[PDB]
Write a protein that holds these residues in place. Sequence first.
Motif, PDB file in Angstrom:
ATOM      1  N   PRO A 123       0.889  -1.630  -0.343  1.00  0.00           N
ATOM      2  CA  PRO A 123      -0.113   0.017  -0.290  1.00  0.00           C
ATOM      3  C   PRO A 123       1.150   1.208   0.482  1.00  0.00           C
ATOM      4  O   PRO A 123       1.928   1.327   0.565  1.00  0.00           O
ATOM      5  N   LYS A 163      -4.317   6.832  -2.817  1.00  0.00           N
ATOM      6  CA  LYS A 163      -4.260   6.096  -2.100  1.00  0.00           C
ATOM      7  C   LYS A 163      -4.469   4.474  -2.789  1.00  0.00           C
ATOM      8  O   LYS A 163      -5.590   4.286  -2.582  1.00  0.00           O
ATOM      9  N   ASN A 177      -4.711   0.927  -1.273  1.00  0.00           N
ATOM     10  CA  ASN A 177      -4.819   0.224  -0.149  1.00  0.00           C
ATOM     11  C   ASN A 177      -4.181  -1.124   0.231  1.00  0.00           C
ATOM     12  O   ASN A 177      -4.295  -1.345   1.122  1.00  0.00           O
TER      13      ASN A 177
END
Length: 172
Positions: free
Chosen positions: A3, A28, A30
């Motif tokens: 991530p 992001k 993740n």
Amino acid sequence: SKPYVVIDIETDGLDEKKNTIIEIGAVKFNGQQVEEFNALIKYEEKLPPTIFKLTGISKSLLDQEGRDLKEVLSEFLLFIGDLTLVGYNIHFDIQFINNKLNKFGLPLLINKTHDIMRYVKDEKLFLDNYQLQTALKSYGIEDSVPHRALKDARLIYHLSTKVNKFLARMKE
Ligand SMILES: Cc1cn([C@H]2C[C@H](O)[C@@H](COP(=O)(O)O)O2)c(=O)[nH]c1=O
Ligand SMILES: [Mg+2]
Ligand SMILES: [Mg+2]
């Protein structure tokens, strides 16, 4: 496969102390899929019309859609957690973010960081210069840089997936 969060900010100037943040954005990964963060920031000063020229952001936009900086920074900390942060000349963003976190009595960033610009400098030795716009072209990304936080973060993320030395370090 690890991530990470690509971050980008817009500001009203270059001085981490005297100038301020007008927009935050982040992309992001993740570990499974992409999530996004974005907020314009309420602003009570006089935005240099050079900022309008560069970003398209006006006082009217910040008045209408901006949110309180401290509130936004707290949400930003929850969005990034302790994940590796990624950017393009990322010290600019970190210096501003940490200055404002400190100002509001919020925790400062201790995240690990990678700077896509550093990798570009080593892979693309013959670029005319190393502005983000120039780096994107070198990797087959022809988008114009809009100088908006989330839109720029998306471009930096796209670039990140094309820089092999960065991907090798993030593997597993
Ligand atoms: C490119 C540039 C940015 N800046 C400030 C305002 C921008 O929102 C901030 C980050 O730049 P950026 O659009 O590349 O993400 O830095 C200037 O003050 N003058 C400039 O010439
Ligand atoms: Mg930037
Ligand atoms: Mg930007």
